[PDB]
């Protein structure tokens with residue numbers, strides 16, 4: 001009894017609008033966009049440069065060709081730390097954003113993101129019990145408040161849990177079972193809702209190596225797995241050279257440099273992507289289990305000038321088309337990581353301030369890849 005029970009209005013199981021299995025639900029989704037740096041921002045929905053999610057944004061997203069949004073959400077900072085009660089106002093706000101995305105005929109995946117680290121950086125036997133308790137209390141509140149949405153709303157229990165060995169993986173399995181049991185306990189449409197479970201560090205290789213099983217579920221065929229993809233780091237996100245490796249400015253057959261050769265990839269090209277996706281195809285998809293590719297993007301390097309710029313941008317685009325297409329070919333649901341930035345080292349494909357397209361190049365790539 002570290003915190004009180006938040007499962008206070010359990011409802012009869014309700015199969016209405018909840019007719020699809022994870023596999024069927026997955027058939028409906030081919031392209032996803034993260035509302036990145038927004039509802040998960042530390043300090044508030046607008047503390048990381050993005051405006052509050054508006055219907056206009058969600059209408060643009062649907063209209064641009066996305067079927068789904070992944071909505072990272074911060075929770076801990078809105079919560080009474082003694083009782084783990086989440087502000088009702090935050091809860092209403094997350095509900096309201098869910099309602100609007102569902103008004104726009106988008107599928108929606110809400111998580112508890114990094115959220116300041118309380119779970120994500122503490123996949124550890126010392127923290128296991130208090131974190132299991134907090135997981136339970138928060139998921140009880142989130143699931144109850146969102147209980148009435150149809151199958152357009154999926155839940156994801158964690159973001160990127162830092163488990164790098166089998167001991168930490170056993171703690172993660174517990175954190176995931178707690179999530180599943182929380183949500184199911186609230187009843188209603190939550191008795192059948194599709195839930196998404198995260199691999200260790202959402203890393204394909206560590207998931208293949210460490211993952212053992214899915215949490216136990218009272219529902220039949222309502223679970224998906226999730227990985228992320230930022231491979232190779234040197235291209236997608238590296239902003240400075242280190243002793244151990246240099247930033248890649250270019251990527252893809254066709255788009256490599258002959259002037260500035262050390263800025264080409266030494267790894268993480270087309271074959272590696274295909275290989276990593278095949279691990280996820282054989283461990284999960286062939287076994288009956290869709291895989292959410294919850295985040296991928298290669299950041300823009302607008303600090304390049306002239307011919308270097310022009311070439312980086314061509315490979316960047318292709319990287320995104322290639323990832324999308326190769327994931328879809330193997331039953332991974334690709335969700336683009338959009339942090340809303342339109343500046344250097346950012347990933348925003350929309351201009352959130354004007355509800356317009358900022359990077360038509362990357363959007364067409366994603367679409368043609370879809």
Ligand SMILES: *CC(=O)N[C@@H]1O[C@H](CO)[C@@H](O[C@@H]2O[C@H](CO[C@H]3OC[C@@H](O)[C@H](O)[C@H]3O)[C@@H](O[C@@H]3O[C@H](CO[C@H]4OC[C@@H](O)[C@H](O)[C@H]4O)[C@@H](O[C@@H]4O[C@H](CO)[C@@H](O)[C@H](O)[C@H]4O)[C@H](O)[C@H]3O)[C@H](O)[C@H]2O)[C@H](O)[C@H]1O
Pocket residue numbers: 036037047048049114159160201202228229237295339340341342343344345346
């Ligand atoms: C493995 C995996 O899948 N990881 C995922 O990685 C992606 C890619 O990194 C993550 O998204 C990134 O999140 C960080 C926040 O990071 C926290 O949560 C993720 C944790 O893993 C990490 O340990 C945590 O620190 C985002 O960084 C934050 O960005 C905001 C906004 O401003 C920046 O980004 C937009 C650009 O346009 C802009 O140029 C750049 O500054 C920062 O907020 C600003 O901070 C300044 C500094 O004081 C302040 O002036 C200003 O008013 C604020 O707006 C914040 O400082 C910074 O932490 C990153 O953008 C995002 O891509 C994903 O969450 C993982 O799941």
Ligand SMILES: [Cl-]
Pocket residue numbers: 028
């Ligand atoms: Cl349908």
